[PDB]
Design a protein around this ligand. Sequence first.
Ligand SMILES: [Cl-]
Lengths: 16, 511
Amino acid sequence: XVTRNDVXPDSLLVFX
Amino acid sequence: DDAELATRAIPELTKLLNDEDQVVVNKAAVMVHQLSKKEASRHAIMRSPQMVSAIVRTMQNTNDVETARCTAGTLHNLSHHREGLLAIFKSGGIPALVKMLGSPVDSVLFYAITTLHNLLLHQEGAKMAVRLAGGLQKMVALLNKTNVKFLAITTDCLQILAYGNQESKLIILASGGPQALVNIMRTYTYEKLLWTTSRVLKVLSVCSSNKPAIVEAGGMQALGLHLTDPSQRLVQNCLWTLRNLSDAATKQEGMEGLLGTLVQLLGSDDINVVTCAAGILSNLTCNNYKNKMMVCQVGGIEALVRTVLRAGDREDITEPAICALRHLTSRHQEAEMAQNAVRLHYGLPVVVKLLHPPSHWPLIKATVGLIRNLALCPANHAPLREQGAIPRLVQLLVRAHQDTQRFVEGVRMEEIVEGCTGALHILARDVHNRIVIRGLNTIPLFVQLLYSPIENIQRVAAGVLCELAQDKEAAEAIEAEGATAPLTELLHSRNEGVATYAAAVLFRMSE
Ligand SMILES: [Cl-]
């Protein structure tokens, strides 16, 4: 599906 | 037609195949093969369990390549019919054929893999059967062959078996699948093979084991080669795979080719292409300054600003487009150029608009983060003020702070409180912005935020207050709110930002 993960100042949209 | 003759022949040919003379076995294997080549007599062979069982045992146990080729060839032909496919299965053909995927005869490997292919698609029971016979290990081992039609069939068996079976994915990973599949994508031009391979890597891309192995095998760059292919299904399966992989690829290098194409794909007429490109770019611009610089160098800021305009309310586009602009407007040699470019490409109005409904919290959170970055460029101070950023940032802040005193749409309101106060911290560098911020009667809320247990909220609260306290009137307002009480406690904080800002506000309020 999609999960949001903050990585310090920037962020990751983890796509399944 | 033959018909009659075929039936009378089978019983004898069965006995000849099980004979001791491996010369008679071979001539039998040859005539059996030849019978299997005509529909008339092929139906004859499939009707005979004993004959089919004799073919499978010959193939499995022969040392004549001729009779391996002929017997496998017969099974290839039987496998084109219902009766034949069930025959092969019931004759224990699936274990036999998997053995033959170790053959050092090319014709035998071909017949073997096509037969297993027809079984996987057309015979219930065959998927579990091939799995238990060690077919995956054999098929992954075969990904080093060079015949593009053979590889297309092998990768298609791998896709069938990997799909919704996490053990088969781990077997493909443990057998060296990812490296072999990536090697295919950057060697062959055969569309069917590239497509089929991209579909295998897609199934594997959602596996948190395989994902990093595919990226480390150089899978981002390989899938990148194909993003401008005439074939839609190739490009789309590559885009989908890259998206699935992208969050594990922030530390890969040699990604300039990819990033260039993704900036170009933002311009696609297909909104699926635009959405995947935005999401991949969002992830690859996440704490990697080389990527951020490259995306700026190839018209990234303009292309993303235009995606956001194009997207309107479709938050599936704007959220990753806005995160990308956010990443591109901070912490890299060209962050200042980018902050200007957003304004010059007419981004500021749309950006401030996205703070309002119907935007949901995750987009609003990204948009606040971006405005915070845009406001680092002094030439944005007036434009952002003029688009009414400040009153809307304060309204979001108050609501979050009120909400937090009892979170929503998968966002913490504690997070909106930080973001908004941070964006106001930076905008407060401008004297006209400070007049507006004071005008909204925000100083009391900023001072209550100094009582937050959250270091990051402490820092931005002390931050904006430090900016306001430049001006006599505000420094007096802040003092009148009993700010010295929490501020002298924040003096002695482990957090540098907090203690440094606390000391600054206090200094600007002292005799
Ligand atoms: Cl559209």
